[PDB]
Amino acid sequence: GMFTCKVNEHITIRLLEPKDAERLAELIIQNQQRLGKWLFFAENPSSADTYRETIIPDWRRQYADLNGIEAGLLYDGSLCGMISLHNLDQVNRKAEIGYWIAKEFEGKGIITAACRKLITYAFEELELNRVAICAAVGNEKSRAVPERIGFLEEGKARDGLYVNGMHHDLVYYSLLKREW
Amino acid sequence: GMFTCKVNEHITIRLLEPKDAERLAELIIQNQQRLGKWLFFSSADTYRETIIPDWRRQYADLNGIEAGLLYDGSLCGMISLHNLDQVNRKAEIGYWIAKEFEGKGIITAACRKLITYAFEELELNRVAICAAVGNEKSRAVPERIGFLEEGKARDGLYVNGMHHDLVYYSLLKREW
Amino acid sequence: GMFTCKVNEHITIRLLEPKDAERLAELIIQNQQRLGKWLFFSSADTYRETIIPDWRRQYADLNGIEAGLLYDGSLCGMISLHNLDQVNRKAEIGYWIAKEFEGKGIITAACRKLITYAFEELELNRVAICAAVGNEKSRAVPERIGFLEEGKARDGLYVNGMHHDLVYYSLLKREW
Amino acid sequence: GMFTCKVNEHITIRLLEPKDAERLAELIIQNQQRLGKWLFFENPSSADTYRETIIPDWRRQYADLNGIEAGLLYDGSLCGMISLHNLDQVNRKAEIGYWIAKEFEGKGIITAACRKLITYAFEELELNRVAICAAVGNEKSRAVPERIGFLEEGKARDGLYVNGMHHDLVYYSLLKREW
Amino acid sequence: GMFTCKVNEHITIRLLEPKDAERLAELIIQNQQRLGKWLFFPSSADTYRETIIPDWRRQYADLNGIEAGLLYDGSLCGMISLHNLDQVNRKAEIGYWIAKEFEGKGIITAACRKLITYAFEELELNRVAICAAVGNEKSRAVPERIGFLEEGKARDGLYVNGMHHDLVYYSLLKREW
Amino acid sequence: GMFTCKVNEHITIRLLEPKDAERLAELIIQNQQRLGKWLFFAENPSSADTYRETIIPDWRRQYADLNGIEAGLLYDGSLCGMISLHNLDQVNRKAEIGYWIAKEFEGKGIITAACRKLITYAFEELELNRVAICAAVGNEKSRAVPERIGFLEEGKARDGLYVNGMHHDLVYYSLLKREW
Ligand SMILES: [Cl-]
Ligand SMILES: [Cl-]
Ligand SMILES: [Cl-]
Ligand SMILES: [Cl-]
Ligand SMILES: [Cl-]
Ligand SMILES: [Cl-]
Incomplete structure (x- = not known):
């Protein structure tokens, strides 16, 4: 990585590149039954070849154009998961944050630290x-993230998610610049 | 329009076109300092060459509709289906109408279709x-229709310099 | 469809959508023949991802309309306004329909709209x-509407290894 | 011009470049309307728009292989355009059009370039x-197809709008098994 | 071809066209790599007809460079290109290769000159x-016959089948004309 | 910038963004009657709109597409120049470096330090x-950069540069990854 984001001597954020295709792909299979509650939706597989030629390139192109960041999370130099800034709406001065992490790295404070930078x-x-x-109302290591950083619940989206044939509510948390 | 959406008499919905440009801009200037609370917000050339065509390509590519409202054959506002998200099987609806045509019950009937x-x-x-919190006129729409209030976005809107909260309403396919 | 053209209680003309891809291909195969005599050109895939997307985009950009014909609700064929030439203030109209539905006076009524x-x-x-010099059922259309014959295109067509002539019919605003 | 079409010691045909802009805008205005009849079209556009849009678009079209929009060069210089359009591959046909200045008439330029x-x-x-095809009352173009061996096919009623009005178009086709 | 560069009575240069795709693919397969040294180093008719040839054409339309075929007696014996065009610095580079079958006939030299x-x-x-691989006699000779001067070497400028070789560079100035 | 390169405590490298256009354009008008010895010619120089709408955006896509870097040099926070890696030839496994700096920032070793990263x-x-x-033959300050890091002079480009009306030679320099 020429351009990089050091969160702390253990956590690093960087934009994926195509050569990141294999690990991501594999890294999403090793956790292929779960990763949908964390608003992504890998119930039906990654490809590596698809990631190499389309998804990652699209992601970079998007960073190039400035609508958001689809980035990888790194712990001791390995892809553990991804973090993201999306729905960027400059006129209204707001964006949203998403993320997800491989089970093995649950509990080290990664996501919370990455969100802070x-x-x-x-x-x-x-x-x-x-x-x-936002996070599925239902159970959440994920809701736990906005709550230690200090976001406020602001509302719910009824049936906001459609993961694995099921309808779930989505709960919203927001953080204002003046509060931070 | 070859292709059109009759809501009832007086009220027809249709994609805009380059030629709608002179009137759309006129209609937006006479209302400039309002559409923003109505979540929208101008050089009538820009619409002809860039904005109307983009809205049209976007409809051709299937993500959303930005359409014009017509009262008795004239453009009196817009209605719009955006944030389409096929994965979560949900979208959102915005709208706005020129004062001139307020109160004749257009938006409501337009949304219904x-x-x-x-x-x-x-x-x-x-x-x-979704509506700015202070605009009872828009909120009135989800409310007669039967949506349920779901929450707020603190500081959701930035209208001409200030912060305002947005308030969301939702309707499920089964409650319909 | 949000936006249709209602010809008349049986017949609506409307843009095609990717999801018409499956029916649209079943409907061209069961008619792989007969169809180049009505002057028309693959997989439910190529339509889903490439063909219809471009027709729609063409419509969004304003050159012509490639629409489907719909009898009592389902696709039975397609009507077309092509070679739009603005400067010269002219265009052409082509069309085809599935055998299943040749008797209902669909084409003619769509053409009229x-x-x-x-x-x-x-x-x-x-x-x-325009029509293959030898497709009586096609020639009938302009004729019934009152188009004049203007001439022929020598070998204007190439339908399966062989070539056939095209006959032109035209209709001027001050006649209609 | 690296790649070129030598009709004869006199006439050459070749793609235009952006640098041809100045002299195409100029050669056309020298002759405001004498053009919509010749099936171009008026309100003559500038050298910039020819240099930055029209000529590049013509070249890209040639690269993709549908049509030629080429300049006509009579002994060194730009005296007109000839072109191949409505190229219909499934029906294996195209249409040819052209125009040359009032200054180069008579020398059989169009006829010769058409042949190649x-x-x-x-x-x-x-x-x-x-x-x-050509406007009924425009003998100058008409003489071309008649000179080469095309056959009159039909007229499109009101097929042209030169300035203000409409004129008819007369068509001429030339099949292959036939030249 | 409508538009053509006539080098001489036997040699013509022209933009390739999609239909040239089967012949270029074969011309390359039966030569192969002894062309990596030329500066070419595969892929199919399919890839030539639907991507490589069109980009080539489009780049000719855009006025940045020429990728053309060499024709000997109406037939494709190889290619020549004007690449790395730098209008501001008033400079370009020229490359080429021809099939062995057509070696020695003076083609490359002739087309370069044109x-x-x-x-x-x-x-x-x-x-x-x-430029040319340091040890590619056949290729180095063209520039020297024409009167280009060796300008310098690019260390490890080439990569031919896992080995790296030096590139030698020759320049020719307009006034040296 | 989220993603940057910390060269050292004063010098940072980053992709430029449309909002750097005003500063870039001014820096370019400010110099420019050099900037040719430096091998970066606008010729018909900047225009803050052009860099914002076209030039900076394309550079960003190139970075996404993975074929080069056009980055900004920041001394203590603000643009003082640009560094660049271009002519990326993945097949021959080689590339070139360019860079320019504003006069007021000359002589602090920004370029050298940044070329090493x-x-x-x-x-x-x-x-x-x-x-x-590569560099203009008589561009001592530029030439100094390669020679200080240990590249070797490889050859010359006769009339390779064309500055303000006239021609000058380019001298080339190269570093082979096994000499490191
Ligand atoms: Cl965590
Ligand atoms: Cl209302
Ligand atoms: Cl019928
Ligand atoms: Cl003539
Ligand atoms: Cl030789
Ligand atoms: Cl330095």
Whole structure:
């Protein structure tokens, strides 16, 4: 990585590249039954070849054009999962954050730390005013993230998700620049 | 229009076209300092050359409809289905109408047709409407129709300099 | 469809959609023959991802309309306004329909609507219909509507290894 | 011009470049309307728009292989355009059009350039049919197809809008088994 | 072809066309790699007809470079290109290769010369450069016959089947004309 | 910037963004009657709109597409120049480096320091074999950069540069990944 984001001496964020195709792909299979509650939706497989030629390239192109960041999470130099800034709406000065992490790395404080830099990035660099995270109401290591950083529940989206044939509610949390 | 959507008499819905440009801009200037609370917000050339055509390509590519409203054959506003998300089987609906035509019950009837389309044609499960918190006129729409208030986005809107909260309403395909 | 053209209680003309891909291909195969005599060109895939997407985009950009014909609700064929030439204020109209439905006077009634569009909305001065010099059922159409024969295109067609001539018919605004 | 079409010691045909802009805008205005009849079209556009849009678009079209929009060069310089359009591959046919300045009339330029274009059409493209149409009252173009061996096919009623009005178009086709 | 560059009575240069795709693929397969040294180093008719040839054409339409075929007695014996065009710096490079079957007939030299006049007279560049693997006699000789001067070496400029070789560079200045 | 390259405590490298256009354009008008010896010619120089709408966006896509870097040099926070890796030839495993700096920032070793990070990346990530740098023959300050890091002079380009009306020679320099 020429351009990189050091979160701490253990956590690193960087934009994927095509050569990241294999690990991501494999890294999404090793956890292929679960990873849908964390608003992504890999109930039906990654491909590696698809990631190499289309998804990652599209992701970079998007970073190039400035609508968001689809990035990889790194712990001791290995892809553990991904973090993301999306639904960027400059006029309204806001974006949302998503993320997910391989089970093995659950519990080391990765996502929470990665979100913090990403939050700092969002408020100081993009001069955004609001950042939101959402998570399936249902159970959450994921809701736990906005709650240690200090977001506020603001609402629910009834049937906001459609994972594995099932309808779930989505709960919204938001954090304002002045509160941060 | 070859292709059109009759809501009832007086009220027809249709994609815009380059030639709608001079009037769309006129209609937007006479209302400039309002559409924003209505979640929208101009050089009538830009619409002809860039914005109307983009809205059209976007409809051709199937993600959303940005359409014009017509009262008795004239453009009096817009209605719109955006944030289409086929994976979560949900979308959202926005709208705005020129003062001139307020109170004749257009938006409501227009949304009713749009929701129908969302629900039996795109087979969406969820439809939301979103309104700045202080604008009773828009909120009145989800409310007569039967949506349920779902939450707020703190600081959701940035209208001419200030912060305002947005409030969401939703309708499920089964409550319909 | 949000946006249709209702010809008349049986017949609606409407844009095609990717999801028409499966029926559209079943309907061309069961008619792989007969169809180049009505001057028309693969898989439910190529239609789903490439052909219809471009027709729609063409419509969004304003050159012509490649629409489906719908009898009592389902696709029975397609009607077309092509070679739009604005400067010269003219265009052509082609069309085809599945055998299943050849008796219902669909093509003619659709054509009649599209003609109205060409002259009243597109403000065109001229519309032409073209046909294989030997397709009596095609030739009938312009003729019944009142088009004049203008001439022939020598070898204008190449249908399966062989070539056949094309006959032109035209209709001027001040006649319709 | 690296790649070129030598009609004869006198006439050459070749793609235009952006640098040809100045002299195409200029050669056309020298002659405001004498053009919509010649089936171009008026309100003559500038050198910039020819240099940055029209000529590049013509070249890309040639690269993709549908049609030629080429400049006509009479002994060194730009005296007109000839072109191959409505190239219909499934029906194996195209249409040829052209125009030259009032200054180059008489020298058989169009006729000569057409021939090569046609020859290309029939054995390279392997097209079956080549057509030319022209305004009924525009003997100058008409003499061309009649000179080469095309047959009058029909007239399109009101097929042209030169300036303000409408005139009819007369058609001429030339099949392959036939030249 | 409508548009053609006539080098001489036996040699013509022209843009390739999709239909040229089967012949280029074969011409390359039966030569193969002894062309990696030329500066070419595979893929099919299919890839040539639907991607490589079109990009080539499109780049000719855009006025950046020429990728053309060499024709000996109406037939494709190889290619020549004007690449790395740099209009601001008034310079370009020229490359080529022909099939063995057609070696020794003076084709490459002949087309280079034509290509050169054009680089100098019509595009009005000041500089023209050519390069070649340090040990590719056949290729190095063209520039020297024409009167290009060796300008320098690019260390490890080539990569031919896992080995790296040096590139030697020759330039020719307009006034040296 | 989220993703950057910390060269050292004062010098950072980053992809430029549309909002850097005003500063880039001004820096370019400010110099420019050099900037030719430096091998970066606008010729018909900047225009803050053009860099914002076209030039900076394309550079960003190139970075996404993975074929080069057009980055900004920041001293203590702000643009003082650009570094660049271009002519990326993955097949021959080689590429070239360019860079320019504003006069007021001359002589602090920004370029050298930044080229080393760039090289590192070139040799240990794109895994290139060769890296070159070229410069105007009489551009002592530029020439100094390669020679200080230990490249070797490889040859000359006769009239390779064309500055303000006239021609000058380009001299080439190259570093082979096995000399590191
Ligand atoms: Cl965590
Ligand atoms: Cl209302
Ligand atoms: Cl019928
Ligand atoms: Cl003549
Ligand atoms: Cl030789
Ligand atoms: Cl330095």
